[PDB]
Amino acid sequence: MLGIFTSLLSSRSFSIVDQNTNQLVAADLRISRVNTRFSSVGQRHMLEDGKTKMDSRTIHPMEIIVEVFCPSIDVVDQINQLLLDRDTL
Amino acid sequence: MLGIFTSLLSSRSFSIVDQNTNQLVAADLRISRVNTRFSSVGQRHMLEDGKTKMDSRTIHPMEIIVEVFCPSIDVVDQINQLLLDRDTL
Amino acid sequence: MNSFLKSILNTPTLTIRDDVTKLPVWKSLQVKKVEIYSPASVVSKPLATKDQTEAQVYTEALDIDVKNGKIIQPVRLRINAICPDLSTVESIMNAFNDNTSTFAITSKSILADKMAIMTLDVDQSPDMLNAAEINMEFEQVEPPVLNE
Amino acid sequence: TSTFAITSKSILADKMAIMTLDVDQSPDMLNAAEINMEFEQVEPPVLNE
Amino acid sequence: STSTIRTGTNNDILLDDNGNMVILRDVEACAQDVRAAMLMRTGENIFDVNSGVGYFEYIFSPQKSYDDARKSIADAILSSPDVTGIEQLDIDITGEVFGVDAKVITIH
Amino acid sequence: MINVSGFGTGIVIVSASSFPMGFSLSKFADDESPISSKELEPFGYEMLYDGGLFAFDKAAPLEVSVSVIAGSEDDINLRILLNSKKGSFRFLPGIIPDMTTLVATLPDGGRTVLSNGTIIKGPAIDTIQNTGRRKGNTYTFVFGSYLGAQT
Amino acid sequence: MINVSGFGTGIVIVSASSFPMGFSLSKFADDESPISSKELEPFGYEMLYDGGLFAFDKAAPLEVSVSVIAGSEDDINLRILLNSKKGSFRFLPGIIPDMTTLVATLPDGGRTVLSNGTIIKGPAIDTIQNTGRRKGNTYTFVFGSYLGAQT
Amino acid sequence: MINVSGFGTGIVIVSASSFPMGFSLSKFADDESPISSKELEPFGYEMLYDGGLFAFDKAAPLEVSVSVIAGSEDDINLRILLNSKKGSFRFLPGIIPDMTTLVATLPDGGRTVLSNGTIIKGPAIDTIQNTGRRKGNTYTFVFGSYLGAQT
């Protein structure tokens, strides 16, 4: 989307930067589509007279679904390591 | 369907009549399709020998689904009033 | 196709105001679809009737029973739009994340009030390289009961 | 209380009652209406000696 | 069963020939109440404030869309007792006239 | 012999709001068919599971299309009709601009009273062909009333 | 006698950012239609379940297409217009390069003011036909205003 | 006058791995189009619920197709290019065998610099027509870089 004039003819779209050590991860994946779907839940409460109070709202965690093409076996191994990586965000 | 020979070239098909005050409501709806689906449930009871007695039958309430085009804002507001109308059948 | 020639009393301009501040929020949010679902709930079990009574003494009792046996569920909207700017999307994400948020969506002629965001989907695909399709869902926190 | 005996091409399914009944009125069938009925066997034809 | 004192077009208590106050009931009372409710500017009730028509924020102002004016007028009409709803609400705009026409379906 | 010539055919199109008095089409195109109606289908059939047949009614629109010479007064009037949104007119239980086309087909007297319809589609701008001559403009209307033929 | 010729037709394309002053198309193609627009459909009809008809408004684009001779200055300008990404300009509440084509059709004076639109598709490279002569290049624009026609 | 002839057109195809120095196509087919390109579509339009128009960028490949005489050296080189699996070469952040075609379209010096692409399809074996003359072979490439034209 607009918002930022990069004025750069080589800008990178997708990045998975490891939060600790601040390093690029799987810098070769060929992305094809990204869906960052949010979620939240209401608390509909019917009450006596025909009416319904929603009460509060809970902010459920966001999810991202990325479709990619892996052209290299090392990239496939890196993705498997990401899945098996329980200690880095 | 047939059963009645109106012999009249201006007979109106759809009619939502308020049961009390006997008045037409939402008279400008342009109906497109109507599905008056019934419902009922059996009480299949398997018993000893290979067999199943259905017992009796309970008549679940009728459902009717009307697809329509509302041409005007007052008709849309009349539909909203119908939904919010909890005191008339 | 001159789309600036909109109707006067049924103008097709979605306007998401903010109840707290009374200001249009998320402008430049080209809207591609708006669906407004307003459900309810009626009795499932057969109501009892006390017949062998009179005209208009059965009618009022039936009216009370009918008003007694139907419950209204809140309205929800599903706006499908296309955000052209990152600022609008950042604002939408922040408003969604904020726990306290009541807005007033005004569709073509619908004036749904006190609505809060339930769902936000931002889809980025190779056929929309600039801008990205967005699917927001709102739900009514409380019907507009007139505070006397 | 309703028991019928549906006889298809060669079946004689008996002791059969209506469970569901759908009547559809569409703009492509201005006269007549398309109906979809469902039947269930209340009791298999056990031979009452 | 609504009831209201008889008022003239000047919105003042209009008496009868014998110097009494007429108490209209049902249809005429509801019609007069609706006419009186549509003539009350918003924020004029010390005890309601939010009630009243938006004659200075929705009408009489460079407002982009008159749907808000339509909603305010509809709310003002529905605020009267025994009104149920509105069958039709025309919001036509003439050169300098904001023509409004209602078709209330009051229960009487 | 039977004379089936279409010369002398005239059309009078009268609209509810745009043209209360109506206009007349007499200048028809030289390459496109001046009048062309899609096949009306007011009946339908279904097959029973015993090989039988069932006949019923179905909703049938009359899709008529008239072709006019590019740049003519009839083309200008039809463009004016095309460029007139239904949302800017008052509403009645009838159709939003319910225009009718009284068609007089050949001086024999055949009159068609096609009514209760709207305009569906038409060309916004003139298309210049390969030959260099502007293509005739075809405007399509749809109608729900298709009776009134005489002689 | 109606003159439906096409000689003398000129187009002036003015773009919001790429060509603020605009350029002129006069060198139209010889094999393809110099100007061709799809059938506009600003209305729609639906069938009620009692056989009636309902007419409503729809969203209608104007898909215009202009054909130019390969290698001409008009073709170069149109290719420059085509190879201009929408992501490299500022946002305004208006359309990203909101380009308008003023069409002066014939010396009679018919002016069409198609505006609020942008180019959609076109040939990036010149295709050489079987006969050995480069094919004419047809660039398609889409527009959201067909009003302004005169005479 | 405008010379839109195609005689003298030369193509230089250089691949990253198969033909690092590249080869030259000059013997084009006599029946099929020597160069044929599908219309590039780098933009798209969508309709808002108020009838408005939105214009956005969409991904657009350039599908080129060159036709050569069956049995020629250019045909043999193109078959060698086609029969080279992408999995048999090494990998870089770039594309697998990046092949670019420099098109000198005329003595004008068009100099089309189509790059960032690969071959997609073509004929493996020569087909013999009814007449008995082997049909010209058309090989299709796709590209993602479509800028560099001069004059």
PDB file of N, CA, C and O in Angstrom, chain C residues 8-29:
ATOM      1  N   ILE C   8     -29.592  11.702  -3.295  1.00  0.00           N
ATOM      2  CA  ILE C   8     -29.574  12.710  -2.240  1.00  0.00           C
ATOM      3  C   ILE C   8     -29.951  12.113  -0.888  1.00  0.00           C
ATOM      4  O   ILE C   8     -29.278  12.363   0.117  1.00  0.00           O
ATOM      5  N   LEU C   9     -31.014  11.309  -0.827  1.00  0.00           N
ATOM      6  CA  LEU C   9     -31.459  10.711   0.426  1.00  0.00           C
ATOM      7  C   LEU C   9     -31.112   9.232   0.542  1.00  0.00           C
ATOM      8  O   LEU C   9     -31.432   8.616   1.562  1.00  0.00           O
ATOM      9  N   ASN C  10     -30.475   8.650  -0.471  1.00  0.00           N
ATOM     10  CA  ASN C  10     -30.025   7.260  -0.429  1.00  0.00           C
ATOM     11  C   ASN C  10     -28.609   7.178  -0.988  1.00  0.00           C
ATOM     12  O   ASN C  10     -28.280   6.318  -1.806  1.00  0.00           O
ATOM     13  N   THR C  11     -27.760   8.097  -0.553  1.00  0.00           N
ATOM     14  CA  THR C  11     -26.411   8.190  -1.092  1.00  0.00           C
ATOM     15  C   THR C  11     -25.606   6.948  -0.727  1.00  0.00           C
ATOM     16  O   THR C  11     -25.666   6.489   0.420  1.00  0.00           O
ATOM     17  N   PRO C  12     -24.877   6.361  -1.666  1.00  0.00           N
ATOM     18  CA  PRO C  12     -24.048   5.176  -1.367  1.00  0.00           C
ATOM     19  C   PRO C  12     -22.661   5.541  -0.851  1.00  0.00           C
ATOM     20  O   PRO C  12     -21.629   5.249  -1.452  1.00  0.00           O
ATOM     21  N   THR C  13     -22.605   6.193   0.305  1.00  0.00           N
ATOM     22  CA  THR C  13     -21.332   6.561   0.917  1.00  0.00           C
ATOM     23  C   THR C  13     -21.253   5.930   2.297  1.00  0.00           C
ATOM     24  O   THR C  13     -21.969   6.345   3.214  1.00  0.00           O
ATOM     25  N   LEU C  14     -20.385   4.934   2.449  1.00  0.00           N
ATOM     26  CA  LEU C  14     -20.129   4.380   3.768  1.00  0.00           C
ATOM     27  C   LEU C  14     -19.336   5.382   4.590  1.00  0.00           C
ATOM     28  O   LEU C  14     -18.302   5.888   4.144  1.00  0.00           O
ATOM     29  N   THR C  15     -19.819   5.671   5.794  1.00  0.00           N
ATOM     30  CA  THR C  15     -19.174   6.633   6.685  1.00  0.00           C
ATOM     31  C   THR C  15     -19.072   5.992   8.062  1.00  0.00           C
ATOM     32  O   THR C  15     -20.079   5.827   8.755  1.00  0.00           O
ATOM     33  N   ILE C  16     -17.856   5.620   8.448  1.00  0.00           N
ATOM     34  CA  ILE C  16     -17.598   5.046   9.762  1.00  0.00           C
ATOM     35  C   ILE C  16     -17.204   6.196  10.681  1.00  0.00           C
ATOM     36  O   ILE C  16     -16.069   6.670  10.652  1.00  0.00           O
ATOM     37  N   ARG C  17     -18.154   6.662  11.484  1.00  0.00           N
ATOM     38  CA  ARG C  17     -17.869   7.687  12.474  1.00  0.00           C
ATOM     39  C   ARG C  17     -17.314   7.042  13.739  1.00  0.00           C
ATOM     40  O   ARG C  17     -17.195   5.821  13.846  1.00  0.00           O
ATOM     41  N   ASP C  18     -16.968   7.874  14.717  1.00  0.00           N
ATOM     42  CA  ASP C  18     -16.499   7.406  16.014  1.00  0.00           C
ATOM     43  C   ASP C  18     -17.374   8.040  17.080  1.00  0.00           C
ATOM     44  O   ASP C  18     -17.427   9.268  17.189  1.00  0.00           O
ATOM     45  N   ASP C  19     -18.057   7.204  17.867  1.00  0.00           N
ATOM     46  CA  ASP C  19     -19.066   7.713  18.792  1.00  0.00           C
ATOM     47  C   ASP C  19     -18.459   8.662  19.816  1.00  0.00           C
ATOM     48  O   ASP C  19     -19.080   9.663  20.189  1.00  0.00           O
ATOM     49  N   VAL C  20     -17.248   8.360  20.286  1.00  0.00           N
ATOM     50  CA  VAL C  20     -16.616   9.194  21.303  1.00  0.00           C
ATOM     51  C   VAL C  20     -16.331  10.588  20.757  1.00  0.00           C
ATOM     52  O   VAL C  20     -16.628  11.598  21.404  1.00  0.00           O
ATOM     53  N   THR C  21     -15.765  10.667  19.552  1.00  0.00           N
ATOM     54  CA  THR C  21     -15.282  11.938  19.028  1.00  0.00           C
ATOM     55  C   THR C  21     -16.156  12.531  17.931  1.00  0.00           C
ATOM     56  O   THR C  21     -16.005  13.720  17.628  1.00  0.00           O
ATOM     57  N   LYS C  22     -17.061  11.749  17.339  1.00  0.00           N
ATOM     58  CA  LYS C  22     -17.946  12.214  16.268  1.00  0.00           C
ATOM     59  C   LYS C  22     -17.111  12.801  15.123  1.00  0.00           C
ATOM     60  O   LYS C  22     -17.075  14.005  14.860  1.00  0.00           O
ATOM     61  N   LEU C  23     -16.362  11.899  14.486  1.00  0.00           N
ATOM     62  CA  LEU C  23     -15.503  12.252  13.372  1.00  0.00           C
ATOM     63  C   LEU C  23     -15.413  11.060  12.435  1.00  0.00           C
ATOM     64  O   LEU C  23     -15.369   9.916  12.908  1.00  0.00           O
ATOM     65  N   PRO C  24     -15.386  11.283  11.121  1.00  0.00           N
ATOM     66  CA  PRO C  24     -15.243  10.164  10.177  1.00  0.00           C
ATOM     67  C   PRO C  24     -13.862   9.537  10.296  1.00  0.00           C
ATOM     68  O   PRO C  24     -12.845  10.226  10.200  1.00  0.00           O
ATOM     69  N   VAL C  25     -13.830   8.227  10.506  1.00  0.00           N
ATOM     70  CA  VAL C  25     -12.582   7.493  10.656  1.00  0.00           C
ATOM     71  C   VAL C  25     -12.416   6.569   9.458  1.00  0.00           C
ATOM     72  O   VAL C  25     -13.394   6.169   8.815  1.00  0.00           O
ATOM     73  N   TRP C  26     -11.163   6.239   9.157  1.00  0.00           N
ATOM     74  CA  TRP C  26     -10.796   5.392   8.022  1.00  0.00           C
ATOM     75  C   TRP C  26     -11.431   5.887   6.724  1.00  0.00           C
ATOM     76  O   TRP C  26     -12.139   5.160   6.029  1.00  0.00           O
ATOM     77  N   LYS C  27     -11.169   7.150   6.406  1.00  0.00           N
ATOM     78  CA  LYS C  27     -11.542   7.642   5.093  1.00  0.00           C
ATOM     79  C   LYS C  27     -10.569   7.100   4.051  1.00  0.00           C
ATOM     80  O   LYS C  27      -9.506   6.565   4.376  1.00  0.00           O
ATOM     81  N   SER C  28     -10.942   7.244   2.782  1.00  0.00           N
ATOM     82  CA  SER C  28     -10.215   6.628   1.674  1.00  0.00           C
ATOM     83  C   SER C  28     -10.104   5.121   1.898  1.00  0.00           C
ATOM     84  O   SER C  28      -9.018   4.550   2.012  1.00  0.00           O
ATOM     85  N   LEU C  29     -11.268   4.491   1.976  1.00  0.00           N
ATOM     86  CA  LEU C  29     -11.426   3.078   2.295  1.00  0.00           C
ATOM     87  C   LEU C  29     -12.393   2.437   1.318  1.00  0.00           C
ATOM     88  O   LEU C  29     -13.402   1.849   1.709  1.00  0.00           O
TER      89      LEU C  29
END
